[PDB]
Write an enzyme that holds these catalytic residues in place. Structure first.
Site, PDB file in Angstrom:
ATOM      1  N   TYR A 171      -8.481   7.958  11.328  1.00 41.98           N
ATOM      2  CA  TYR A 171      -7.982   8.416  12.631  1.00 41.98           C
ATOM      3  C   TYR A 171      -8.783   9.472  13.423  1.00 41.98           C
ATOM      4  O   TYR A 171      -8.262  10.045  14.379  1.00 41.98           O
ATOM      5  CB  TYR A 171      -6.496   8.769  12.501  1.00 41.98           C
ATOM      6  CG  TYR A 171      -5.654   7.596  11.981  1.00 41.98           C
ATOM      7  CD1 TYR A 171      -5.261   7.531  10.636  1.00 41.98           C
ATOM      8  CD2 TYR A 171      -5.287   6.539  12.829  1.00 41.98           C
ATOM      9  CE1 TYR A 171      -4.515   6.436  10.137  1.00 41.98           C
ATOM     10  CE2 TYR A 171      -4.548   5.437  12.341  1.00 41.98           C
ATOM     11  CZ  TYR A 171      -4.167   5.406  10.989  1.00 41.98           C
ATOM     12  OH  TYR A 171      -3.402   4.375  10.512  1.00 41.98           O
ATOM     13  N   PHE A 196       2.592   9.458   3.073  1.00 42.29           N
ATOM     14  CA  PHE A 196       2.909   9.440   4.474  1.00 42.29           C
ATOM     15  C   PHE A 196       3.357   8.077   4.952  1.00 42.29           C
ATOM     16  O   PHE A 196       3.943   7.956   6.012  1.00 42.29           O
ATOM     17  CB  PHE A 196       1.736   9.982   5.311  1.00 42.29           C
ATOM     18  CG  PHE A 196       0.493   9.110   5.328  1.00 42.29           C
ATOM     19  CD1 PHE A 196      -0.677   9.547   4.715  1.00 42.29           C
ATOM     20  CD2 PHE A 196       0.454   7.922   6.070  1.00 42.29           C
ATOM     21  CE1 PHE A 196      -1.874   8.827   4.845  1.00 42.29           C
ATOM     22  CE2 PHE A 196      -0.741   7.188   6.208  1.00 42.29           C
ATOM     23  CZ  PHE A 196      -1.905   7.648   5.593  1.00 42.29           C
ATOM     24  N   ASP A 197       3.081   7.039   4.170  1.00 41.21           N
ATOM     25  CA  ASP A 197       3.487   5.678   4.545  1.00 41.21           C
ATOM     26  C   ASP A 197       3.491   4.833   3.286  1.00 41.21           C
ATOM     27  O   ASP A 197       2.804   5.172   2.332  1.00 41.21           O
ATOM     28  CB  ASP A 197       2.529   5.081   5.587  1.00 41.21           C
ATOM     29  CG  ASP A 197       3.120   3.888   6.312  1.00 41.21           C
ATOM     30  OD1 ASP A 197       4.340   3.616   6.168  1.00 41.21           O
ATOM     31  OD2 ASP A 197       2.367   3.213   7.046  1.00 41.21           O
ATOM     32  N   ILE A 249      -7.195   0.319  10.519  1.00 42.58           N
ATOM     33  CA  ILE A 249      -8.345   1.189  10.573  1.00 42.58           C
ATOM     34  C   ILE A 249      -9.606   0.558  10.000  1.00 42.58           C
ATOM     35  O   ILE A 249      -9.537  -0.309   9.133  1.00 42.58           O
ATOM     36  CB  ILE A 249      -8.058   2.515   9.881  1.00 42.58           C
ATOM     37  CG1 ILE A 249      -7.819   2.322   8.386  1.00 42.58           C
ATOM     38  CG2 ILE A 249      -6.838   3.162  10.543  1.00 42.58           C
ATOM     39  CD1 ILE A 249      -7.708   3.634   7.631  1.00 42.58           C
ATOM     40  N   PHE A 267      -5.628   5.535  -0.056  1.00 42.96           N
ATOM     41  CA  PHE A 267      -4.681   4.429  -0.086  1.00 42.96           C
ATOM     42  C   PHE A 267      -4.680   3.730  -1.453  1.00 42.96           C
ATOM     43  O   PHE A 267      -5.719   3.589  -2.100  1.00 42.96           O
ATOM     44  CB  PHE A 267      -5.023   3.408   1.016  1.00 42.96           C
ATOM     45  CG  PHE A 267      -4.702   3.877   2.417  1.00 42.96           C
ATOM     46  CD1 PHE A 267      -5.642   4.578   3.167  1.00 42.96           C
ATOM     47  CD2 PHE A 267      -3.459   3.607   2.986  1.00 42.96           C
ATOM     48  CE1 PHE A 267      -5.351   5.009   4.483  1.00 42.96           C
ATOM     49  CE2 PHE A 267      -3.156   4.032   4.292  1.00 42.96           C
ATOM     50  CZ  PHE A 267      -4.109   4.731   5.038  1.00 42.96           C
ATOM     51  N   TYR A 279       0.821  -1.209   0.000  1.00 45.21           N
ATOM     52  CA  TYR A 279       0.000   0.000   0.000  1.00 45.21           C
ATOM     53  C   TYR A 279       0.845   1.244   0.000  1.00 45.21           C
ATOM     54  O   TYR A 279       2.063   1.179   0.166  1.00 45.21           O
ATOM     55  CB  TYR A 279      -0.906   0.037   1.244  1.00 45.21           C
ATOM     56  CG  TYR A 279      -0.138   0.195   2.554  1.00 45.21           C
ATOM     57  CD1 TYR A 279       0.166   1.466   3.080  1.00 45.21           C
ATOM     58  CD2 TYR A 279       0.331  -0.917   3.238  1.00 45.21           C
ATOM     59  CE1 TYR A 279       0.920   1.604   4.233  1.00 45.21           C
ATOM     60  CE2 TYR A 279       1.083  -0.794   4.387  1.00 45.21           C
ATOM     61  CZ  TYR A 279       1.375   0.463   4.882  1.00 45.21           C
ATOM     62  OH  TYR A 279       2.137   0.546   6.025  1.00 45.21           O
TER      63      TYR A 279
HETATM   64  N   NH4 Z   1      -6.895   8.875  16.390  1.00 49.92           N
END
Ligand code: NH4
Length: 107
Positions: free
Chosen positions: A82, A36-37, A56, A99, A26
């Site tokens: 989040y 970010f990742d 998540i 994503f 991903y």
């Molecule tokens: N959070």
């Protein structure tokens, strides 16, 4: 909720079930398109068991609608990622995440 857009089709028949381990690659991005990742940069696929809430809400619901081999773009709302608090330093409050997920196999 989460919105799934196919990038490349999977087998069209093997969908993940609760208790299975999904092996994916991903790349996470913020609404701006900033990364970010990414398991791709680490060149190592990520694994998680569907249903054990270790990722998540948006991944557990979105990846459950993907089939093996499928690569999709998930657009996930704050409530499924989040929240209001985000994760200060990495994820802003009330952030909609995008994503690019590819489902490699199931274990
Ligand atoms: N959070």
């Amino acid at each position: 909720g989460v919105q799934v857009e196919t990038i490349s089709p999977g087998d069209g028949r093997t969908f993940p079930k609760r208790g299975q381990t999904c092996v994916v690659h991903y790349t996470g991005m913020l609404e701006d398109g900033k990364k970010f990742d990414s398991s791709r940069d680490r060149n190592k696929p990520f694994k998680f068991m569907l249903g054990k809430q270790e990722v998540i809400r948006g991944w557990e619901e979105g990846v459950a609608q993907m089939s093996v081999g499928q690569r999709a773009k998930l657009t996930i709302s704050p409530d499924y990622a989040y929240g209001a608090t985000g994760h200060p330093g990495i994820i802003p409050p009330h952030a909609t995440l995008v994503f690019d997920v590819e489902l490699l196999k199931l274990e």
